[PDB]
Amino acid sequence: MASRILLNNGAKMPILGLGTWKSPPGQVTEAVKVAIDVGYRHIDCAHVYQNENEVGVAIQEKLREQVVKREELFIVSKLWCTYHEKGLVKGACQKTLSDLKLDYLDLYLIHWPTGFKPGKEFFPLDESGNVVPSDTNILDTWAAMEELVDEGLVKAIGISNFNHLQVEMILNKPGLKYKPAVNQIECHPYLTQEKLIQYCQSKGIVVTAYSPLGSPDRPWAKPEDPSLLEDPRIKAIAAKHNKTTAQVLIRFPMQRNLVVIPKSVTPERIAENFKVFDFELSSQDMTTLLSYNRNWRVCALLSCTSHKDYPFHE
Numbered sequence: 001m002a003s004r005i006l007l008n009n010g011a012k013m014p015i016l017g018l019g020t021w022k023s024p025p026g027q028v029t030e031a032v033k034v035a036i037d038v039g040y041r042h043i044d045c046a047h048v049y050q051n052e053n054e055v056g057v058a059i060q061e062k063l064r065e066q067v068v069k070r071e072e073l074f075i076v077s078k079l080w081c082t083y084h085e086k087g088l089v090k091g092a093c094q095k096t097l098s099d100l101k102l103d104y105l106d107l108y109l110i111h112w113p114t115g116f117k118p119g120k121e122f123f124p125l126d127e128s129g130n131v132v133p134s135d136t137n138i139l140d141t142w143a144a145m146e147e148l149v150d151e152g153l154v155k156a157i158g159i160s161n162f163n164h165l166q167v168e169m170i171l172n173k174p175g176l177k178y179k180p181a182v183n184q185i186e187c188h189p190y191l192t193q194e195k196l197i198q199y200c201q202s203k204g205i206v207v208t209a210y211s212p213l214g215s216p217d218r219p220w221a222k223p224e225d226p227s228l229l230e231d232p233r234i235k236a237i238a239a240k241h242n243k244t245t246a247q248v249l250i251r252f253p254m255q256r257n258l259v260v261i262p263k264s265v266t267p268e269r270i271a272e273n274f275k276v277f278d279f280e281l282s283s284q285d286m287t288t289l290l291s292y293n294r295n296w297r298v299c300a301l302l303s304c305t306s307h308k309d310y311p312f313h314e
């Protein structure tokens with residue numbers, strides 16, 4: 001299987017990338033350096049993760065060392081919810097560029113379809129704990145994203161956590177100039193996403209699977225929760241293939257024509273997670289993994305559920 005997938009902007013995107021949510025700022029520079037040294041060419045970033053400066057130090061050092069050329073890297077970041085206003089989008093993108101020490105992003109995503117009140121707080125709350133919305137709709141935010149392409153700041157734009165009706169809203173936008181290249185959504189054997197993936201792929205939108213290992217370090221983890229890495233059924237498939245459970249969980253979305261972005265700051269695991277191009281899951285393996293769906297989400301947030309554009313009511 002090829003290492004990159006063709007996007008609808010004409011560029012190629014590596015199907016395996018390194019995630020950086022929760023990667024501590026004192027560890028993520030070495031994580032990204034190791035990742036690039038062992039073959040990763042795609043890093044998934046976001047302003048809200050608060051570690052883009054440190055990710056950028058690694059990228060810049062590997063460019064300076066000539067381990068890789070800039071054109072060989074595929075760097076992704078995301079517009080946070082408090083920057084959905086027309087007059088804030090360019091500055092948000094430029095801050096991310098400055099932190100990552102880049103002149104352009106390969107892909108810039110609307111992180112969530114929900115706009116929040118601008119300000120210093122990433123989750124502005126009213127006194128009862130509800131997030132305070134912005135009245136800026138996803139279509140105007142999309143037009144602002146299109147401007148970034150036309151100013152040379154980003155090569156591609158896309159969306160994240162958009163449900164099928166929200167994707168449709170963008171695709172049906174009056175005067176749409178650029179289609180979204182990517183929809184980045186949660187996807188793993190407990191949230192298999194058949195309907196949304198089919199829809200996006202049918203429209204030429206590439207899907208990126210996040211939390212492919214079930215995000216065991218998510219901060220709201222109840223150890224009551226189901227655990228992909230510990231599921232004996234998935235462990236059995238891994239054993240059959242002489243691979244780790246994580247390697248099976250990463251190969252699974254690859255064989256669905258998805259991009260996948262496992263996170264690690266552990267050098268041994270960063271390398272392990274990349275060694276997934278030399279085995280194949282059978283169709284029976286794939287269908288068996290799909291059968292484990294239970295519509296379980298890592299990423300949901302109670303404080304935002306009354307937002308008009310909350311994506312997971314549908």
Ligand SMILES: NC(=O)c1ccc[n+]([C@@H]2O[C@H](COP(=O)([O-])OP(=O)(O)OC[C@H]3O[C@@H](n4cnc5c(N)ncnc54)[C@H](OP(=O)(O)O)[C@@H]3O)[C@@H](O)[C@H]2O)c1
Nearest residue numbers: 019020021210211212213214215217246262263264265266
């Ligand atoms: N667009 C969005 O809204 C959104 C939401 C969630 C995530 N994402 C992106 O997707 C990325 C991945 O998702 P995620 O961070 O939620 O979780 P994940 O990649 O599913 O899981 C990360 C966890 O798995 C551990 N791990 C990694 N490789 C392992 C291995 N080979 N064996 C055992 N454990 C392993 C990591 O530990 P160590 O790091 O300690 O090794 C970490 O605790 C994020 O970092 C972010 O870039 C995007």
Ligand SMILES: Nc1ccc(CNC(=O)c2ccc(Cl)cc2OCC(=O)O)c(F)c1
Nearest residue numbers: 021046048049050081112114299300301304
């Ligand atoms: N509208 C909205 C916004 C955020 C979430 C869930 N995400 C988080 O709670 C979250 C908060 C801070 C950070 Cl740094 C990361 C988070 O999740 C991962 C992500 O959103 O990429 C959500 F479920 C809905």
